[PDB]
Design a protein around this ligand. Sequence first.
Ligand SMILES: N[C@@]1(C(=O)O)CO[C@H]2[C@H](C(=O)O)[C@H]21
Ligand SMILES: N[C@@]1(C(=O)O)CO[C@H]2[C@H](C(=O)O)[C@H]21
Ligand SMILES: [Ca+2]
Ligand SMILES: [Ca+2]
Ligand SMILES: [Ca+2]
Ligand SMILES: [Ca+2]
Lengths: 744, 744
Amino acid sequence: RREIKIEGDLVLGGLFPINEKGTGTEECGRINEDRGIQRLEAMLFAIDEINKDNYLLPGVKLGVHILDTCSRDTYALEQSLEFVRASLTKLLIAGVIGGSYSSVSIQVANLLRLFQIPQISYASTSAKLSDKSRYDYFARTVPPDFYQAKAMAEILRFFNWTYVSTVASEGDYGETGIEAFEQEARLRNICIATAEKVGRSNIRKSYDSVIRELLQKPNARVVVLFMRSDDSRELIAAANRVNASFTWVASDGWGAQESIVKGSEHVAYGAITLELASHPVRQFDRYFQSLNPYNNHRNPWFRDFWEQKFQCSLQNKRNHRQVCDKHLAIDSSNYEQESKIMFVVNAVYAMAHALHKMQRTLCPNTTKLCDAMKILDGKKLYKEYLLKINFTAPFNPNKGADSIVKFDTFGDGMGRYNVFNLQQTGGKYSYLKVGHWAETLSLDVDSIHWSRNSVPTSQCSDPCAPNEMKNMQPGDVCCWICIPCEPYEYLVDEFTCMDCGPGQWPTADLSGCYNLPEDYIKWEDAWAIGPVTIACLGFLCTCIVITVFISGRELCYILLFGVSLSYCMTFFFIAKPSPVICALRRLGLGTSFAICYSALLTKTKFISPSSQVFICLGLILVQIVMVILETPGTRRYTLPEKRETVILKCNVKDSSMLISLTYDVVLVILCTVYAFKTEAKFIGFTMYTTCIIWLAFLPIFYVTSSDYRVQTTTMCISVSLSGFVVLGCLFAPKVHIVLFQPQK
Amino acid sequence: RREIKIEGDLVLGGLFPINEKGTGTEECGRINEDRGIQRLEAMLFAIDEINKDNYLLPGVKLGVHILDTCSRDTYALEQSLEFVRASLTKLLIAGVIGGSYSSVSIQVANLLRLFQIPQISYASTSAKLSDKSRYDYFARTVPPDFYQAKAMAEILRFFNWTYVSTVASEGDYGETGIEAFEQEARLRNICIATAEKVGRSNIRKSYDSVIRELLQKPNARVVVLFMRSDDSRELIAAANRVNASFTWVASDGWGAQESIVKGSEHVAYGAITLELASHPVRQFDRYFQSLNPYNNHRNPWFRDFWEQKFQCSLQNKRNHRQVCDKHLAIDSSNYEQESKIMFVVNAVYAMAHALHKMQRTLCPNTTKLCDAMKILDGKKLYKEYLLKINFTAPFNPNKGADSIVKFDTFGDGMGRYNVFNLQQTGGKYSYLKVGHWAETLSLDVDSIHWSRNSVPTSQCSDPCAPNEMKNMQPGDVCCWICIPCEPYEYLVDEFTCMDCGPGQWPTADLSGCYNLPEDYIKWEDAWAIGPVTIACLGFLCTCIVITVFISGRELCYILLFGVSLSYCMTFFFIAKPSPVICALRRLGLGTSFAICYSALLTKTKFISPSSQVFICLGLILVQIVMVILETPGTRRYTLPEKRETVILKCNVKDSSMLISLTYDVVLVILCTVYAFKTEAKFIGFTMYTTCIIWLAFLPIFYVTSSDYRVQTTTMCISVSLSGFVVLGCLFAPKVHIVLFQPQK
Ligand SMILES: N[C@@]1(C(=O)O)CO[C@H]2[C@H](C(=O)O)[C@H]21
Ligand SMILES: N[C@@]1(C(=O)O)CO[C@H]2[C@H](C(=O)O)[C@H]21
Ligand SMILES: [Ca+2]
Ligand SMILES: [Ca+2]
Ligand SMILES: [Ca+2]
Ligand SMILES: [Ca+2]
């Protein structure tokens, strides 16, 4: 019963969410101050200007039949029948400036298409409405949501927010808007933590309940809101009750409205919102601010709008009529243009230009309506003129940013968006443009005020440490686990790690492998150094015995050579092992063995036996023909358990050394039964005892087969022990005779 | 232009998908033989019977205004205006038997609610239509999809199909139907592998493309189809081109139709479909089979239906008029009732009963229409009579299975479903009822024919081995990993495993821990057994020395006791270690030490020194006062690397044993300078040599600190060596005198 009707040659219908959707009991609730009245006056402002100028339908006066949708599709369909009552076969509306809600526009488009009434819809961004095979009389001055979904996944990719949660309003704007976003999120490798839907249906969860589900997954600290204006207002309220806090990535449903966050700015602080690219209509705000509840009689809802805006009473709102000041008026202090005001004016002018071009075609003789337009053809108006319209946007400077009002082949606008940030200015909140999106996002990250004073991170799992690997479970991208690889495996990639080569450390960066260092007994071996001094001390004792003198002299020379060789071999064996000098250590054992053979040969005329005694020993075969070992190469000793432990192992296993030296160890048995021959009796007893000590030492080294570093000292101990026996026993008769008896 | 109109006092509207949806060019395609014509004739059959009998509106003749929806909401809205043309303020349809598609029913309900025309809709199962605040003049003889979603998650829970993929038609039946299923899947811990949508919109992927996405995740071998009849027909076709194969869990959209799988039965074999609980109307098939294209003149689509059903030409379909046999007719050979035929008859009768009760109220005097029904009140008809209707279902035996046609408070039916299985009968495919769902599913699993001849498994990850653990990543239930726990940790639960106690094996089931067995040298030690025989052999030699005889006799007794004790201690030490007998091993070392002290005391009048010699040694303090060890308890030797290796370690560390026995080892040094005293000279030399051998043996045991099993044999070797020295040296003079000289 409440409507706007203005007489005119051609009448344009208009659907505006003038009053916000009511509760369950009341179909129509409070008034929509920004998105229901400013837009309504924008249509009225455009129609006044269209009739004012003489270049757009000068001979035709444009009338209006504007209704209210109450933000409900069912209510919108109820009112929309007035546009079609006179159109039955039996005001003859030429066109309809479509609804401001995707559900409302879709509902009314399904009806108007039957009667061939073209519909231009500002602010309706559902991607379903671009299906021209179903809505064949529908065009919009705003882009679809197929582009807004791109502008979100790009923002969620610029900041590596790969683990996000989605909340979407029920209907067509939210269901299809979030359906395209999850498609654009999959391409950019973004994982949806959880997807929820809110609305007034019984299936939908409560706003507190959906808030809990967002909090259940604390890793995803950003949520994307493809929600309507009322749901966005209420969801932020539900986050105030729980006192939660997220980073809000919002759509044009939220947009750049201060009223959504009114009172709950604490949780909505640092929000990222995607408003369509638009500019204020400067001529419009002059028209709007001049309005008063006394002259705007043509607008029925304006009287109620005046009361609600200023919280005063015109006649009986506060049981009286004195609260509303007579001098009070709309000004820049309390008024800010709705973002989609240009898209309403362009929508109205698109209809006028379509008729104006058609009028110049069907009625060229007269500027007024001719007989061809007594009955109007909707299909001709839409397909030929409206769908191919092209003009400079009125009331906008021709700076190129205003661009054109052209529709594309789908009857849609250009996909350009702005990015806003909710910031606090000394206790006052506002939206600041922090980027845009024409085809690639360009964000001014330095000016963004974040919710927690730092760039939010929304990742399913934390990055893995350099010592840690990760793997992809089937169907997941953003979620992994951090398994630390064992200190011997190495990382070819973060996806898999496996062992290096034997005796090969996996470097420090762990992405490569390098051979483990070889270990050998250095000069730090005090015990080995101490035996070396003892071996040198034994040589000094032999030299003292030699210095004392000056039977046969062959025994003295042979005994001296063996003892010195045994002492010298200990120092040589304690040196740094090498593959070239591997045979020297093997030869070192033979040098002591040759000395032992000489003692047996000497103990067993006299001048002749000396030549056959040393020669009989073999002389170690001239050191195996001047000698590099029995095994041509020296092996790096590596255990199955690496543990950063590698030993230098010569080719010889230290097993055949008991054969070459064992030749001189068998003559002691023949001297075991030897007796008398005095004073040669004492010499034989010492030699037998000396051979006994050598046998015990050999089993000790054989027992210590493992622990080469420890077993290495066994050879030094055996070498020192052998020298003591040879020097103590063989040199003992000389010490007790030459030194013991001063006669010599 | 094609419609059915029958004159009557009250006219009922009817929307049926008589012709299947056409391609892009053609709005209306082929005829819907089962779900568009059988239902249409079912409504006509009911109206004939309602006017036939005299107990349901006897004084009122029921007319019909039946239209075709072409299976499109936009086309359905176009036709539905004929029900409302006469209802403007300026046939006066009393009620509408609603559409067969949720999108169609929702679209037409939004229009009829404005003019207060009650709508009864068979076959429309969208859960959105139960929102009586939005569709306040809508009732259905079929349950909502809120119950069908339960019947799926229950089936997907009966068989542990926790990893499933969902395909849903675009619109209201599929979008809301799968929205409720995923809610019922979350409660029953079911993970959705992937959710995909199909349709004729441009956003939707192709049927081949969505088939590929199903194949991308081969773990989920079962998919749930909340899809319409045409999409289910086409999706199965797309699986034939790829020659894929899944297990199909389907909704009433698929239902029990043979036509969906016509030609692609190979991939659709072993399907699980959820058809609403229904019974054939026996009186109806009699009416249907009697129809011929010559008498059913009231049905315009019937002539086209006759041609398409039998692939013949009536007038010019095949460019001639001879293919259609005159004698050909519908019979049981080629005809099977549509499942939702009773729900159509009940829908028609629900309208008749609502008017009949209203007629008995407003016009009780006459059976005909009175002045109160010249203008009909829709709200009174719906709220008071229709919404509270209750009657026995006509043409159905009163067996209780027919039940009542009552609507609940939401204007819906009872949520009872049947479960069908697609099976092959000798090369012929058919659906077999393999269960039902009233409130709990009752499936006959033995009769189910599965797709791959075995029960399908749809799990995200395979079950973990008993040696393997698993963990839950955030937000996942059905997906895990199988990490094999190391052989020393144990499973408190499958979620976490950690180490057992030191020296405690984690049992065999791995869910517990038991102490590792203790290891000790058993009788298998041949070397230890061999030294025992040698030790016994040494005792025999001493006994032979004693038997030879029969200065002073104290030395012979003291020497014999020490040698026998040394040999005996080796056998005692080689026994099984115990904590009670720990001191015996410590005492065993002292027994040899006491013997060594006796030799020093004897070697160092004669009768008097014997008492002070053995007493001077201390006698091991009477075995430490009859002795169970220095450490009160015996420790189980455990090394940080368990490796199923535990050793029995006595409290004594084998370090103080060199002190008690060392008392008898110091007297040898005093005898080192001893000489002469002949024949006591030989005894002293042997004792000094014997002490020397003991010193070398002690370092060998000290070196072998580790390897207790190996180091254990060191004590046996040392014990045997000590006995040889004592017997060889101390007993040597007696052997060479008593045995060597036959005079004694
Ligand atoms: N994006 C909306 C749409 O339906 O297209 C939903 O929220 C409302 C905004 C507006 O009214 O300007 C639209
Ligand atoms: N479940 C359906 C619905 O829209 O409610 C969708 O597929 C069609 C079945 C029918 O026509 O009997 C319905
Ligand atoms: Ca609206
Ligand atoms: Ca909407
Ligand atoms: Ca239909
Ligand atoms: Ca549907």
